[PDB]
Each structure stands twice: as structure tokens, then as C-alpha cells.
Design a protein around this ligand. Structure first.
Ligand code: NA
Ligand SMILES: [Zn+2]
Length: 172
């Protein structure tokens, strides 16, 4: 069922400015939104994308929604900054990652399968198109900053995905 929806599809405001990075992204960073909560209908998930964009641009002074892509509980994928655009989601990785937010609070609940499938399909499509390195490393936000994101339950889930790794597997 899953589709990639454009920025115009969810009624996004324009970015203030767009900065690019070059070549395939060597990292994929997974997030949860926490608030907004899980969205089951496409109207609610489009509103949730606008709510995050509004928080980021109009409360935090950012150029755009900080994420590359969002995933709704409708099983749809929502274009954020998109591929090869510098994000504002993961310090030290914003110019070398795809930042994917699974809308909701995933501290204790597992996202519904359609969200997990959509995230994996987005990554697979990014590798197919050459936007994501075929040897990408998969991380949760909590591995690169002092945060709970993407929630303990979703963290345990992504720990079972292909390409998951720990930064401290390499010494030095
Ligand atoms: Na920004
Ligand atoms: Zn995060």
C-alpha cells in the first residue's frame, strides 16, 4: 500500500534555505517524534508533519522540519528535507545521513507493522536509487547524542534490522 508523498501532498511550508551534501549517504538515523503521537489516518499524519514543521521552523528557528522523511501509522512515507539535503536531526551526521522519524511515542510500544515496513521500504528505495550507500550503517539517535530517541522499544526493534551497528565496535 505504501507510497512516498511529496511535501506539497502534506501542505508543507517552503524551506527558508536548502543546503545539500554530495554522494550516497553512509548513515541512516532512526527517530521517533514523541509528540505528535501515533497517527492512523492520512489526514492526521499530514497534520502531524505540519505540526513538526511548525515546531521546527516557527518555535526552534530552523530552516525546515529537521528530518529527511517521516513515516505515518497510515503506512505512508512523507518527504521532509529529502535525500542529499543537510538535516537538523542528528549532530555530526546531518550532512551524511538520512534521518527518518517514525511519528509517535515508541518508548514502550512497537510501531505497527505498516510503519516498520514503510521505513525498510524507504531505505531499500534509497539504496536502489543511489541516495543511500549500499554499505550504510543504521543507528538510532540515542547512539550519537544524549537522548532517549527513538524510544527503547523501537531501538530494540531497529537493533534487529540489517546494517544496525554500534559506534564503539571500532576503537580509536
Ligand atoms: Na535548520
Ligand atoms: Zn531523534
Amino acid at each position: 500500500t505504501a507510497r512516498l508523498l511529496s511535501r506539497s501532498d502534506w501542505g508543507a511550508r517552503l524551506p527558508k534555505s536548502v543546503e545539500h551534501f554530495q554522494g550516497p549517504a553512509p548513515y541512516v538515523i532512526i527517530h521517533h517524534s514523541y509528540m505528535p503521537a501515533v497517527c492512523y489516518s492520512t489526514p492526521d499524519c499530514m497534520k502531524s508533519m505540519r505540526d513538526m514543521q511548525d515546531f521546527h521552523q516557527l518555535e526552534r528557528g530552523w530552516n525546515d522540519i529537521g528530518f529527511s522523511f517521516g513515516i505515518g501509522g497510515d503506512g505512508m512515507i512523507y518527504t521532509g528535507r529529502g535525500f542529499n539535503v543537510i538535516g537538523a536531526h542528528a549532530p555530526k551526521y546531518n550532512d551524511k545521513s538520512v534521518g527518518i522519524v517514525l511519528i509517535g511515542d515508541w518508548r514502550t510500544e512497537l510501531p505497527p507493522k505498516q510503519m516498520l515496513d514503510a521505513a525498510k521500504n524507504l531505505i531499500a528505495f534509497g539504496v536502489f536509487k543511489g541516495y543511500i550507500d549500499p554499505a550504510y550503517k543504521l543507528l538510532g539517535h540515542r547512539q550519537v547524542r544524549d537522548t532517549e530517541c527513538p524510544g527503547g522499544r523501537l531501538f530494540a526493534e531497529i537493533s534487529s534490522w540489517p546494517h544496525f551497528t554500534h559506534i564503539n565496535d571500532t576503537e580509536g
